[model samples]
Target: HMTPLTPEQTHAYLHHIGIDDPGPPSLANLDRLIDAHLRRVAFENLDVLLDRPIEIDADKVFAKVVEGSRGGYCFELNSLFARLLLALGYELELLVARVRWGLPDDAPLTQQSHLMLRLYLAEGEFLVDVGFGSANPPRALPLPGDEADAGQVHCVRLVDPHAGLYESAVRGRSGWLPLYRFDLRPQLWIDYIPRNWYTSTHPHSVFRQGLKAAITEGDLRLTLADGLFGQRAGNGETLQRQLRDVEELLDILQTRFRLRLDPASEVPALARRLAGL
Candidate 1:
């Protein structure tokens, strides 16, 4: 079982997101909170690139994300969001998703590694995920009537489209492509530890290959995907180029994404790993 964030920790979390006052739990307020969080916190995986281990849970993530100037993957990022929501009278469940992003049409289903949240409110059940990096939705989805209108998503749909799970996708040069699949089943805190270790430690893991950091500025999305930097606009416009070297990557991580990385302890190794030997 996870511990509720203390009053002091709640205040700190609110401050980190730049929220002075959060009105009682409501759809509008939930929208506001998610928006603020996506802007303030980044989706970064520098530790995986540097081969540093990670521990996933709320209290531990609080120190790394809210207390410190760092952001993390879906596991670490959404844990913090759930903590804040729990303390604010919001009811939520942690749900896991199978990644379909970049999945081939003929391939087998991937692992159930993605984490998202399902919110219970007065009107209906809403799907909220603030940890999907640059492609994260700008709004929550209501599981109502029949199918969800994924018009709000970079691309996500449910049910028959995926049969019991929410399917996430990203627009490709060709068209919409699978990103991940998720279900409504609530998950336990203990379920994600081994998955975290495997993702960060496995040699073939994408995170271990190189830098992976992303952040969105309203309609603008920026990504550092394995040294290929891209700036994507809401209107489907995109510009990408391979990074020159580590200095530029460091500057992008620090200045563009607004994450705090230790200069002395974390930079040297980061440069070496990113250079690809």
Candidate 2:
């Protein structure tokens, strides 16, 4: 039998997001949960960068995120969040997404690496993703042609002329840029294992090569990759700085991302080298 989270585990997840009793699953409650999640939990790739194995099992993810008070990338974060929503009596399905950002049109076909959610509300279906480092929507967005905006961030869904795949884009200084493309096909938990393994272990994977973390605070978004830290303000203005040392990077992780790393654990050699240790 599949080991789903127990009632106690579900309660712990809700409590972690500061929602003691969300009452019932509705659009409003979903909105609150997503907002609380994005604000409280961060999207991070510490395990991949630190050479620790990334476990995608439901129980392990629950222990890591809710019990351990940590954050994760797409697979871990979305999978755990799906369990929470399921336990709360929400109707949803997991979908695989192909990230297309920063890729040329002639680039090789992207893998179905990103995990996202589709919420079936009484009014309509919505897309929700809490992972994706920095550009995720603060709340659930209406799928295909609806706008989702939180302060300076604006995102929309458009139909891809090539194959009718739902293409999502976020508005930046240059305007709407493509984020990812996906279909409504339901993805099984087992389908994620290979992709997870490839993403965590592949040498060419960017997550394994560098440090990445992002968190949203009110109208501000803070993102860190390797030695660079960037902040996007409410007015769409961006400010960035490169960390001078490992200590400064750690401070940013703690203060900005609200992540507390164990001092007992040794930092990865690549991370240390990037920080000029």
TM-score of every model versus the real structure: 0.90, 0.89
Cα lDDT of model 2 by residue, 1-277, tens digit:
1235679998899888899888787889998998888877899988777678999988888888887777999999988888888888888888888898876556788888899998898878888888877778777877754454444244546566567578667665565666788888888889889999999999998787777888988688888878888888735588998888887887777777877566656435434745642
Judged by lDDT, which candidate is best?
2
Cα TM-score of candidate 1: 0.90
User: Tens-digit lDDT track for model 1 on 1-277?
Assistant: 6556889999999999899999999999999998888888899988777766787766788988887788899888887788889999999888888776655777886788887888899978887888888677776756532323445445555646545756655545675575567777789878888778777888887777766778887578888887798888866689999988878878888888888878788878777777772
Judging by TM-score against the true structure, name the best candidate: 1
- All predictions: root-mean-square deviation over Cα? 2.6, 2.8
Look at candidate 2 and tell me the lDDT of residue 214: 89
User: What global local distance difference test value does model 1 have?
Assistant: 0.78
